[PDB]
Amino acid sequence: AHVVKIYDTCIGCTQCVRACPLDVLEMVPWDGCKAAQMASSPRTEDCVGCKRCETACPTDFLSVRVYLGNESTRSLGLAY
């Protein structure tokens, strides 16, 4: 499926997870940010690449990136 990569510039604001319509991201404990939270993608096989997480990222550039490629039944959003 698609590739979801999260960098260290994330501030743990949990906006990307709330904007996710397929429950791909998660919040794990961290020490590199003030909020002590870091975004993770343990369910990247269910991500369709809608880039809704990138819209909700408040940091400049993007702390979360979605790269398309190798579309599957789950990645193409097919009910059939």
Partner: protein, 143 residues
């Protein structure tokens, strides 16, 4: 959460007529998703696969063909009535997979029990150029 709940097919479905955007042949060929919640009273909600239904006072079970529909129903129930539902995925052979509350605390929380995966420890824009990774099968963002 502490113990992963097991789905019950005998739980009553919410009061609804016939759906046209319901489960297709993929439900009997590939996996299909099933959402469960616990309604304290009877009320009318809007399904993502059609019009409106009425949930029963008790357990409620619904079936969908896409995980996006299940999470849309979950967030609608959480925003409108604070229901906290949970959906499983059932394959063709009957294998049941727990999907939304992986640690039972919802992904908005942390719970100090999830290991962060697919996290690049370098800043964005510090990735190598595609010329550096050529004829290797490794993307610049996958390292």
């Amino acid at each position: 959460p502490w113990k992963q709940p097991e789905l019950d097919p005998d739980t009553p479905s919410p009061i609804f007529g016939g759906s046209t955007g319901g489960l297709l042949r993929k439900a009997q060929v590939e996996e299909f998703y099933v959402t469960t919640w616990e309604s304290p009273k009877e009320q009318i909600f809007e399904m993502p696969t059609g019009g409106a239904a009425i949930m029963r006072k008790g357990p409620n079970l619904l079936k969908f063909a896409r995980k996006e529909q299940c999470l849309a129903l979950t967030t609608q129930l959480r925003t409108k009535f604070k229901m906290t539902p949970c959906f499983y995925r059932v394959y063709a052979d009957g294998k049941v997979e727990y999907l939304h509350p992986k640690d039972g605390v919802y992904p908005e929380k942390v719970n100090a029990g999830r290991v962060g995966v697919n996290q690049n420890m370098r800043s964005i824009g510090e990735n190598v150029d595609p010329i550096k990774v050529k004829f290797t099968g490794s993307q610049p963002f996958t390292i």
